Amino acid sequence: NANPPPPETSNPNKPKRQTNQLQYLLRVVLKTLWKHQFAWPFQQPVDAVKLNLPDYYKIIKTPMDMGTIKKRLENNYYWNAQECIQDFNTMFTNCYIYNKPGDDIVLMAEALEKLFLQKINELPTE
Numbered sequence: 001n002a003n004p005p006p007p008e009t010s011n012p013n014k015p016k017r018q019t020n021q022l023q024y025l026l027r028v029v030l031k032t033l034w035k036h037q038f039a040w041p042f043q044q045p046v047d048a049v050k051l052n053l054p055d056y057y058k059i060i061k062t063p064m065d066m067g068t069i070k071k072r073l074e075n076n077y078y079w080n081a082q083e084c085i086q087d088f089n090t091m092f093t094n095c096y097i098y099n100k101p102g103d104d105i106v107l108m109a110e111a112l113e114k115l116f117l118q119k120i121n122e123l124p125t126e
C-alpha cells in the first residue's frame with residue numbers, strides 16, 4: 001500500500017570506472033530522453049500512492065525510471081554500458097506490462113523507446 005523505497009543508486013563496494021560509452025549514456029542518451037516532451041511520467045519512480053494505483057507494485061516487482069538511471073550514471077554504479085541499457089529496457093517493459101496496449105502512457109513510452117534505440121545504434125566503440 002505504501003510506495004517501496006526507490007532502487008539502489010550508489011554502492012561503494014563495487015569497483016568504478018569512466019568510459020566513453022558510460023559518458024555517452026549520461027551526456028547524450030539520458031540528457032536527450034530527459035528533455036523529450038513525453039519524459040515527464042518516467043523521470044521519477046512511479047508514485048503509486050499519489051497516482052492512486054494501489055496495484056502498481058503488486059504487478060511491477062522490478063521498478064525503474066530515468067531519475068534512478070541518472071543517479072546510477074552519476075554515482076558510477078554501472079561498470080558496463082549494457083547494465084544501463086537493461087535499466088532503460090526495464091523501464092519501457094514495466095510500462096508495457098502494467099498498462100493497456102494503445103493507452104496514451106504506452107504511446108509515450110513507445111516514442112521514448114524509439115528515440116532511445118536511435119541513440120543506442122550510435123553508441124561509441126568499446
Ligand SMILES: COC(=O)c1cc2c(cc1CS(C)(=O)=O)-c1cn(C)c(=O)c3[nH]cc(c13)CN2c1ncc(F)cc1F
Nearest residue numbers: 040041042044045046047050051094095098099104105108
Ligand atoms: C506528476 O506526474 C504525474 O502525474 C504522473 C502521471 C502518470 C505517471 C507518472 C507520473 C509521474 S509520478 C512521480 O507522479 O509517478 C505514470 C507513469 N508510468 C510509468 C505508468 O506506467 C503509469 N500508468 C499510469 C500512470 C503512469 C498515471 N500517469 C500518466 N498516465 C497516463 C499518461 F498518458 C501519462 C501519465 F503520466
